[PDB]
Amino acid sequence: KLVKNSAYYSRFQTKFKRRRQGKTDYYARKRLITQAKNKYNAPKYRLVVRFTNRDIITQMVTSEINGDKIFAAAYSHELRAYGINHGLTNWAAAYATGLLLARRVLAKLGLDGEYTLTEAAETEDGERRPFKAILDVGLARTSTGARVFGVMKGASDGGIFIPHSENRFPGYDIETEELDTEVLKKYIYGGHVAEYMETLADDDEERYKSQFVKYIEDDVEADSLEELYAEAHKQIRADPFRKYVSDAPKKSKEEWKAESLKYKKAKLSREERKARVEAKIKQLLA
Amino acid sequence: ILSVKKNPSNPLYTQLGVLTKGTIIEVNVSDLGIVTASGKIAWGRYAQITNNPENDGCVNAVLLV
Amino acid sequence: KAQNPMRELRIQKLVLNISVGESGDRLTRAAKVLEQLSGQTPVYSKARYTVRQFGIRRNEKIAVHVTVRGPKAEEILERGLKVKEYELRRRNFSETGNFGFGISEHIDLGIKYDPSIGIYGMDFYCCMTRPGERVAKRRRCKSRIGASHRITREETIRWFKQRFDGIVR
Amino acid sequence: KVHAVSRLAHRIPGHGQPILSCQFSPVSSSRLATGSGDNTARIWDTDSGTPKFTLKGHTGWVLGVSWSPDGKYLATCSMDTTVRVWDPESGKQVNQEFRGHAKWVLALAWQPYHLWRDGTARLASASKD
Amino acid sequence: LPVTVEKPTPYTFDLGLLLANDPNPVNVPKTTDTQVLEQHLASVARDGAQVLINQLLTTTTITATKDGVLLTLPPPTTPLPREKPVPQPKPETKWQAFARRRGIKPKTREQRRNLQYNPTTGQWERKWGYKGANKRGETDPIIEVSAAKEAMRPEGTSVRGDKRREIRARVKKNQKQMLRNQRIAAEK
Amino acid sequence: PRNARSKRALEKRAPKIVENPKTCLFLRGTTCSQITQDAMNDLYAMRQVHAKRFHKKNAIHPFEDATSLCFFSEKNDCSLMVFGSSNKKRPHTLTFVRMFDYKVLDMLEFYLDPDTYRSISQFKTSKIPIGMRPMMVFAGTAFESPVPNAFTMAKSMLIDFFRGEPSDKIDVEGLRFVVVVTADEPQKPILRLRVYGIRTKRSGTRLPRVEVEEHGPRMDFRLGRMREPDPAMLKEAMKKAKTPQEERTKKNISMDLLGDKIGRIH
Amino acid sequence: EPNRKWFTNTRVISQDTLQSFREAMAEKQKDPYTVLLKSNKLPMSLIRDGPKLEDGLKKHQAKMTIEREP
RNA sequence: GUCCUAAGGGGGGCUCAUGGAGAACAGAAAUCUCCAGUAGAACAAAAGGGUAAAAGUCCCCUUGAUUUUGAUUUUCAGUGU
RNA sequence: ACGUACGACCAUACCCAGUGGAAAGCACGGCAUCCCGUCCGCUCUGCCCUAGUUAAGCCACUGAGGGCCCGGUUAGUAGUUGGGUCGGUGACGACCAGCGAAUCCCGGGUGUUGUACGU
């Protein structure tokens, strides 16, 4: 018998579009955005961390009825302005991107005429409150040593109150329930990549050149990475909104509209469709 | 002493509040300087009587920590 | 567009299975044979249902298998086609592009006989796959493989002919 | 305006014994010095919550750590009747240990930076003797 | 520009529901201009929001905590219907009526614990449940059996299931009594 | 209920002294216009957290038989319902149903004006966050009738719809959206539903200056058919249970500032 | 029997509650026509005001002089 | 008549019944591989819309077998902490 | 306008096949020391962004067959209530109103949209 029949197609119920695309866990999303211990009607912020092949995407998101709003965004390709040109997806670049997003959020809020109800009803015994967000890892696996927690560590060190434990950081030992902060420092300043460079340079020179061809070409040694990332952190903390210009071709928005509309294929009209139907009928008759 | 929690011999002895050896009692621990993880002050804890009060004229207890 | 390097056929995995049908020492010896052939620990499979005719019970271990990837799978199925004299029959190749064959003596494969383990026959199944299979296997953005990218019975047949110099009857 | 500290920033392990003294650098809060009973002092980077340096060499509990007013030296006074001066941005000891106290050295005091004469710094150590 | 509005009849408030009631008439223009219509409606909305914000900021106490600035609200006063009836006491069961008539006091939580001390083994064990004292001996190696009782024992049955038989009988009796009480309560 | 999760569900569905927040079921008849569906979408967007939505067509006429509505309330634990329909006599109808003890307490029909209806997406403003309750403002003389009428019932139903979750405290940053319902006593009056976002400005005083900006939706209704509650069922539903944290006041017995029980002698 | 309830805090109190009880104890007045029917179990050593400074100095003056000069 | 570190709770990974094509014994029915599979399986209830990166099924951690406090609600208390 | 990250409606978006893709971005991809996890580095995790490639994913268009969604028609019709209101002793036959379907038929369509950053 045929499984895919008219009754099957009629009774079939599709999933959500992003579930079909495999991009959203709605089970996690409902408990992330619609559930709370306190019912004080306050806004909620989530730190969305996503990873691509060549980039790291960090966003600060609130949820509204017609779609999510992005309070601030930082990317690992913006890190070239602070001096990181290689390894934009590694754990250290994740830390630097999280730190950059933290500094941008604080600078946008001014914690680095219209005035708020908090300022209107502030009590004399009132103190500045930290900015709070909850981590959103999406579909990524939360194992010990993942880079979502590197982004979280960078943002927390930058000054965003993210509730977390420390058993998913690199260097944590589950037997002693203790965190090796030397290993954590090595990962923050990118020393694991440097040990990989030295190990390859000692054992397999061909793999060393093939994997780190850009490091050798731009003269980025293994021993310079610690002070390079430290200087990047200092520059991020100093100037969180530095402008970076890419090597991609630059045109205006209307020029890009014209460029894309020149390659867009238009949808056929009713007259053209009827003409094609008549031509097909004539071909079938002939 | 705040209360008598469990006399090991008899629930009637617990109800009467008999202080004997091995009795679990509730004591006021305000003077010991104990705080919880939330910052709250712990002023009531459990101790066990480690002597014979009828023979000694005093109640000696050990905190259960 | 078939000349593109990303449409090159290659072996994805080779699965070696032994279905002894009885739990205990025979299954243990079959697992030992699979382990010494492959280099990795095998997997015990349990019976789904209870069949009184076959003498099996639900949730009882009756079979053992190993999945092998990489050049190890290639050398093992090369040994198996050395055993089978590089001759395959048309029903062995599936409509989805995979194939397989079963042998009756693992001693013929190139391992020394031991009286402790005995003689076991066992079957090979090779899965053929073009690059781009991560699309249907990754957790995030999992989707289907395109129709032109799928491997057909004729494609795996002449791949076998040109690469392994075998005969298909 | 200084705002009230309300939450934990970092919890950094590494000392093997109870901590007896702590002091920030006068230059910035990014560098902290802690002297403990495990015969060591330690420089911490407080931005990332990581260790930076471990100053070893005392054979008693480091009862006191003290940054120089300009922030270029760190003095440690210990239970082993000694005082040592360390370079905080390299982690190495400056010259040798200071000898001459009979008993436990309990407190330190740098001369103020505007009073430094003869091209040098002066350090006062108070001891149990 | 003022932050206080004047109307012939004052507003009323229910700050528990954040509700402001405006009993003054809303003189909607009898025109066809949607612009001035929504302008008048927005003016009324602005007045209502203004008086509600003023009432909340003046007559609710303010507490500044680590979460933020909170206003302590009164309980709601606007009457609203419930979705389900108020809970009522259950009808008394046969045991509860008998205990009320005979003065039988309920057992204390320490008395009714599933724990007891076994002297012979010198250990703490459960009275019932998994490995309970009601199934004592069913896993021991050696059990003496009396000849008369084993002669009266039917064929196939063993002494290792007698306690399970008694437990099942007691469970069946308790279930029958519970079902009888449930049927009587459903009749009432 | 042998299963623990099923026992949890039954205990959640059981009546309580302090009730759970009410749930609204959104559903449509056999025929339903796109304007009615968009209105139901806007109301669901206002009430996403405590609503369930059906997506099929139901052959239900609420003022003829409501046994199916009682069955749906039974199955979904939904005490409020928004039921959409269409007809030649009434082209755009939103039927609000309020339930009690899985039985129909009362019902009211709203007739939507198709020409003045504006959806949420037609206003280009920042929208309300998910789960955040708005404040409510009811304006006009139609809500102060001495006799209970359709406008009083509409006020009660809209308050119960936009009630949200009860809370003794609220953050001052959660006072940013207001829902205004305007209706006048008198040929049939028009009940107007608007949603605004609140902006505050300095005015030189302690109290800020409130300015509003339209958020959507824009709704115009004419009140139609109404099913009133029975008096006994209304009395039972309007009974207010007393919390166990509410002390029964005893004569000459009080609790002082240190918690001691104090007696009074005259 | 071994039980985890023996090693936990039976009574806890917060700093806000302690401050409120301190304010209440400061604002306590005496009324002859009010009778105490049931005492509230409170950590009264943390609530009651401390002894006077002259008493606190005098109560340790003897031991202080003996420690200074044996 | 047997077996079980009990159930439960939280977190994580996976997708089921079935059909087609294939693989020594293996043949309608044993195990393994691929494809198609709105759930047509399982688990609960008695849907006229229960659940699919789960409420299904396997791993990790707890298993402590019914905690403490209360001037509050209801009932009782000649043994009223 | 195109791409990406979160989304809102949740098939006009789904099931199957073909053609094309400037720019960048996604993606396939390369390597298993360290973090981490499997029978299998298949998945997960880490390192590279160099090199190959648009073959697949993805996007746009087209095509059948289904499916799905709108508007009219059905039609104020069947049917349901109402001596309702007129006769009929009454039951009922019209009429009056209130509610109020569906099948069939016709026509159209095969996704709109928010935030942020880029091309």
Side-chain angles (χ1 to χ4, degrees), chain E residues 24-29 33-50:
Chain E
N24 302 267
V26 183
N27 290 318
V28 174
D33 185 25
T34 80
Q35 188 274 331
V36 73
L37 170 62
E38 316 295 308
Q39 190 272 331
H40 175 74
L41 290 169
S43 66
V44 178
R46 199 221 71 81
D47 291 331
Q50 178 77 56

mmCIF file of all heavy atoms in Angstrom, chain E residues 24-50, unseen atoms left out:
data_model
loop_
_atom_site.group_PDB
_atom_site.id
_atom_site.type_symbol
_atom_site.label_atom_id
_atom_site.label_comp_id
_atom_site.label_asym_id
_atom_site.label_seq_id
_atom_site.Cartn_x
_atom_site.Cartn_y
_atom_site.Cartn_z
ATOM 1 N N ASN E 24 -15.807 59.680 34.378
ATOM 2 C CA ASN E 24 -16.156 60.856 33.599
ATOM 3 C C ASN E 24 -16.492 60.451 32.164
ATOM 4 O O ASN E 24 -15.918 59.497 31.631
ATOM 5 C CB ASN E 24 -15.006 61.861 33.612
ATOM 6 C CG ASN E 24 -14.630 62.299 35.013
ATOM 7 O OD1 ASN E 24 -15.131 63.303 35.517
ATOM 8 N ND2 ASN E 24 -13.741 61.545 35.651
ATOM 9 N N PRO E 25 -17.433 61.146 31.521
ATOM 10 C CA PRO E 25 -17.769 60.814 30.131
ATOM 11 C C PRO E 25 -16.643 61.170 29.174
ATOM 12 O O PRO E 25 -15.899 62.131 29.387
ATOM 13 C CB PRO E 25 -19.021 61.655 29.860
ATOM 14 C CG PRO E 25 -18.909 62.798 30.802
ATOM 15 C CD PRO E 25 -18.269 62.241 32.042
ATOM 16 N N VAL E 26 -16.526 60.381 28.112
ATOM 17 C CA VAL E 26 -15.501 60.564 27.091
ATOM 18 C C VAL E 26 -16.190 61.182 25.881
ATOM 19 O O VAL E 26 -16.802 60.480 25.074
ATOM 20 C CB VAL E 26 -14.814 59.243 26.739
ATOM 21 C CG1 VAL E 26 -13.701 59.473 25.732
ATOM 22 C CG2 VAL E 26 -14.275 58.580 27.993
ATOM 23 N N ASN E 27 -16.079 62.500 25.737
ATOM 24 C CA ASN E 27 -16.788 63.215 24.677
ATOM 25 C C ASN E 27 -16.101 62.926 23.349
ATOM 26 O O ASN E 27 -15.254 63.685 22.876
ATOM 27 C CB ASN E 27 -16.836 64.708 24.975
ATOM 28 C CG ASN E 27 -17.744 65.036 26.143
ATOM 29 O OD1 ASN E 27 -18.832 64.477 26.272
ATOM 30 N ND2 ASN E 27 -17.298 65.947 27.001
ATOM 31 N N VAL E 28 -16.473 61.804 22.748
ATOM 32 C CA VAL E 28 -15.951 61.426 21.431
ATOM 33 C C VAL E 28 -16.539 62.360 20.378
ATOM 34 O O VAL E 28 -17.766 62.560 20.352
ATOM 35 C CB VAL E 28 -16.291 59.966 21.125
ATOM 36 C CG1 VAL E 28 -15.889 59.607 19.705
ATOM 37 C CG2 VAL E 28 -15.607 59.046 22.122
ATOM 38 N N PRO E 29 -15.719 62.974 19.526
ATOM 39 C CA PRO E 29 -16.255 63.847 18.474
ATOM 40 C C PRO E 29 -17.107 63.075 17.477
ATOM 41 O O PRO E 29 -16.809 61.930 17.130
ATOM 42 C CB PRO E 29 -14.995 64.419 17.814
ATOM 43 C CG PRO E 29 -13.903 63.469 18.176
ATOM 44 C CD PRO E 29 -14.247 62.953 19.533
ATOM 45 N N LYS E 30 -18.178 63.715 17.015
ATOM 46 C CA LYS E 30 -19.081 63.110 16.036
ATOM 47 C C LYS E 30 -18.664 63.499 14.616
ATOM 48 O O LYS E 30 -19.449 63.996 13.810
ATOM 49 C CB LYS E 30 -20.521 63.517 16.324
ATOM 50 N N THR E 31 -17.393 63.256 14.322
ATOM 51 C CA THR E 31 -16.804 63.545 13.026
ATOM 52 C C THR E 31 -16.351 62.247 12.367
ATOM 53 O O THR E 31 -16.456 61.158 12.938
ATOM 54 C CB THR E 31 -15.637 64.525 13.167
ATOM 55 N N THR E 32 -15.840 62.374 11.145
ATOM 56 C CA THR E 32 -15.335 61.235 10.396
ATOM 57 C C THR E 32 -13.818 61.181 10.320
ATOM 58 O O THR E 32 -13.287 60.350 9.573
ATOM 59 C CB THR E 32 -15.902 61.235 8.967
ATOM 60 N N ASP E 33 -13.107 62.028 11.060
ATOM 61 C CA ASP E 33 -11.653 62.058 10.979
ATOM 62 C C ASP E 33 -11.044 61.092 11.987
ATOM 63 O O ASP E 33 -11.089 61.325 13.205
ATOM 64 C CB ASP E 33 -11.133 63.476 11.212
ATOM 65 C CG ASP E 33 -9.630 63.583 11.030
ATOM 66 O OD1 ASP E 33 -9.055 62.757 10.290
ATOM 67 O OD2 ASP E 33 -9.022 64.492 11.633
ATOM 68 N N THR E 34 -10.453 60.014 11.465
ATOM 69 C CA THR E 34 -9.814 59.019 12.317
ATOM 70 C C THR E 34 -8.618 59.605 13.051
ATOM 71 O O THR E 34 -8.301 59.174 14.164
ATOM 72 C CB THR E 34 -9.388 57.809 11.486
ATOM 73 O OG1 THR E 34 -8.158 58.102 10.811
ATOM 74 C CG2 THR E 34 -10.454 57.468 10.456
ATOM 75 N N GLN E 35 -7.956 60.599 12.452
ATOM 76 C CA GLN E 35 -6.806 61.233 13.091
ATOM 77 C C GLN E 35 -7.207 61.906 14.399
ATOM 78 O O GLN E 35 -6.617 61.642 15.452
ATOM 79 C CB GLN E 35 -6.165 62.233 12.124
ATOM 80 C CG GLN E 35 -4.833 62.838 12.578
ATOM 81 C CD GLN E 35 -4.993 64.061 13.464
ATOM 82 O OE1 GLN E 35 -5.971 64.802 13.350
ATOM 83 N NE2 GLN E 35 -4.033 64.277 14.356
ATOM 84 N N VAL E 36 -8.246 62.746 14.362
ATOM 85 C CA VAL E 36 -8.667 63.437 15.578
ATOM 86 C C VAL E 36 -9.372 62.467 16.522
ATOM 87 O O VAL E 36 -9.357 62.647 17.746
ATOM 88 C CB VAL E 36 -9.541 64.663 15.238
ATOM 89 C CG1 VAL E 36 -10.926 64.261 14.762
ATOM 90 C CG2 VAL E 36 -9.627 65.614 16.428
ATOM 91 N N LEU E 37 -9.953 61.389 15.973
ATOM 92 C CA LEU E 37 -10.584 60.387 16.829
ATOM 93 C C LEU E 37 -9.552 59.661 17.690
ATOM 94 O O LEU E 37 -9.692 59.592 18.921
ATOM 95 C CB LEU E 37 -11.372 59.394 15.974
ATOM 96 C CG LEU E 37 -11.902 58.132 16.656
ATOM 97 C CD1 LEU E 37 -12.881 58.488 17.762
ATOM 98 C CD2 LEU E 37 -12.553 57.210 15.638
ATOM 99 N N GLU E 38 -8.486 59.149 17.068
ATOM 100 C CA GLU E 38 -7.438 58.500 17.848
ATOM 101 C C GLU E 38 -6.626 59.511 18.647
ATOM 102 O O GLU E 38 -6.027 59.153 19.662
ATOM 103 C CB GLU E 38 -6.525 57.654 16.957
ATOM 104 C CG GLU E 38 -7.244 56.797 15.933
ATOM 105 C CD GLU E 38 -8.105 55.724 16.569
ATOM 106 O OE1 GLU E 38 -7.587 54.968 17.416
ATOM 107 O OE2 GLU E 38 -9.301 55.636 16.222
ATOM 108 N N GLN E 39 -6.618 60.783 18.236
ATOM 109 C CA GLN E 39 -5.973 61.805 19.057
ATOM 110 C C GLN E 39 -6.730 62.017 20.364
ATOM 111 O O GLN E 39 -6.120 62.110 21.437
ATOM 112 C CB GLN E 39 -5.859 63.111 18.270
ATOM 113 C CG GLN E 39 -4.991 64.189 18.916
ATOM 114 C CD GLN E 39 -5.755 65.081 19.878
ATOM 115 O OE1 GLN E 39 -6.956 65.296 19.720
ATOM 116 N NE2 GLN E 39 -5.060 65.602 20.881
ATOM 117 N N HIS E 40 -8.062 62.086 20.296
ATOM 118 C CA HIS E 40 -8.872 62.212 21.505
ATOM 119 C C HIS E 40 -8.749 60.969 22.381
ATOM 120 O O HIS E 40 -8.634 61.070 23.613
ATOM 121 C CB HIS E 40 -10.329 62.470 21.118
ATOM 122 C CG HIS E 40 -11.269 62.508 22.283
ATOM 123 N ND1 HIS E 40 -11.324 63.569 23.160
ATOM 124 C CD2 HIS E 40 -12.201 61.621 22.704
ATOM 125 C CE1 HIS E 40 -12.244 63.331 24.077
ATOM 126 N NE2 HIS E 40 -12.791 62.156 23.823
ATOM 127 N N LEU E 41 -8.754 59.787 21.757
ATOM 128 C CA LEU E 41 -8.591 58.550 22.518
ATOM 129 C C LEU E 41 -7.214 58.477 23.174
ATOM 130 O O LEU E 41 -7.086 58.012 24.312
ATOM 131 C CB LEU E 41 -8.824 57.342 21.612
ATOM 132 C CG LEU E 41 -10.269 57.127 21.159
ATOM 133 C CD1 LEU E 41 -10.337 56.072 20.071
ATOM 134 C CD2 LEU E 41 -11.149 56.745 22.336
ATOM 135 N N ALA E 42 -6.179 58.956 22.481
ATOM 136 C CA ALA E 42 -4.838 58.972 23.052
ATOM 137 C C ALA E 42 -4.730 59.984 24.182
ATOM 138 O O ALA E 42 -3.979 59.772 25.136
ATOM 139 C CB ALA E 42 -3.808 59.271 21.964
ATOM 140 N N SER E 43 -5.468 61.095 24.092
ATOM 141 C CA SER E 43 -5.495 62.052 25.197
ATOM 142 C C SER E 43 -6.136 61.446 26.442
ATOM 143 O O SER E 43 -5.621 61.612 27.558
ATOM 144 C CB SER E 43 -6.238 63.318 24.776
ATOM 145 O OG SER E 43 -7.605 63.044 24.529
ATOM 146 N N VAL E 44 -7.250 60.728 26.264
ATOM 147 C CA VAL E 44 -7.892 60.047 27.393
ATOM 148 C C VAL E 44 -6.967 58.982 27.977
ATOM 149 O O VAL E 44 -6.844 58.842 29.205
ATOM 150 C CB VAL E 44 -9.244 59.452 26.956
ATOM 151 C CG1 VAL E 44 -9.898 58.702 28.103
ATOM 152 C CG2 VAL E 44 -10.164 60.552 26.466
ATOM 153 N N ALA E 45 -6.293 58.225 27.105
ATOM 154 C CA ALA E 45 -5.348 57.207 27.551
ATOM 155 C C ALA E 45 -4.176 57.815 28.305
ATOM 156 O O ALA E 45 -3.713 57.252 29.304
ATOM 157 C CB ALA E 45 -4.841 56.419 26.351
ATOM 158 N N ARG E 46 -3.670 58.954 27.827
ATOM 159 C CA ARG E 46 -2.576 59.638 28.502
ATOM 160 C C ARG E 46 -2.998 60.116 29.881
ATOM 161 O O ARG E 46 -2.231 60.006 30.841
ATOM 162 C CB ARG E 46 -2.095 60.814 27.654
ATOM 163 C CG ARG E 46 -0.712 61.306 28.015
ATOM 164 C CD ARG E 46 -0.646 62.822 27.996
ATOM 165 N NE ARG E 46 -1.372 63.412 29.115
ATOM 166 C CZ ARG E 46 -0.891 63.527 30.344
ATOM 167 N NH1 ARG E 46 0.325 63.111 30.654
ATOM 168 N NH2 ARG E 46 -1.650 64.077 31.288
ATOM 169 N N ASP E 47 -4.221 60.641 29.997
ATOM 170 C CA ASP E 47 -4.725 61.076 31.298
ATOM 171 C C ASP E 47 -4.837 59.903 32.266
ATOM 172 O O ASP E 47 -4.426 60.000 33.432
ATOM 173 C CB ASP E 47 -6.079 61.763 31.127
ATOM 174 C CG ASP E 47 -5.970 63.093 30.411
ATOM 175 O OD1 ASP E 47 -4.912 63.746 30.526
ATOM 176 O OD2 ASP E 47 -6.940 63.486 29.729
ATOM 177 N N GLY E 48 -5.377 58.776 31.790
ATOM 178 C CA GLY E 48 -5.514 57.607 32.649
ATOM 179 C C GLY E 48 -4.178 57.025 33.075
ATOM 180 O O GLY E 48 -3.987 56.674 34.245
ATOM 181 N N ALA E 49 -3.232 56.929 32.138
ATOM 182 C CA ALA E 49 -1.900 56.442 32.473
ATOM 183 C C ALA E 49 -1.194 57.385 33.436
ATOM 184 O O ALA E 49 -0.490 56.935 34.347
ATOM 185 C CB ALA E 49 -1.075 56.258 31.202
ATOM 186 N N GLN E 50 -1.393 58.695 33.263
ATOM 187 C CA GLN E 50 -0.774 59.673 34.149
ATOM 188 C C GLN E 50 -1.287 59.531 35.574
ATOM 189 O O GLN E 50 -0.495 59.476 36.521
ATOM 190 C CB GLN E 50 -1.032 61.085 33.622
ATOM 191 C CG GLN E 50 -0.466 62.183 34.494
ATOM 192 C CD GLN E 50 1.027 62.339 34.326
ATOM 193 O OE1 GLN E 50 1.517 62.543 33.215
ATOM 194 N NE2 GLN E 50 1.760 62.244 35.427
#
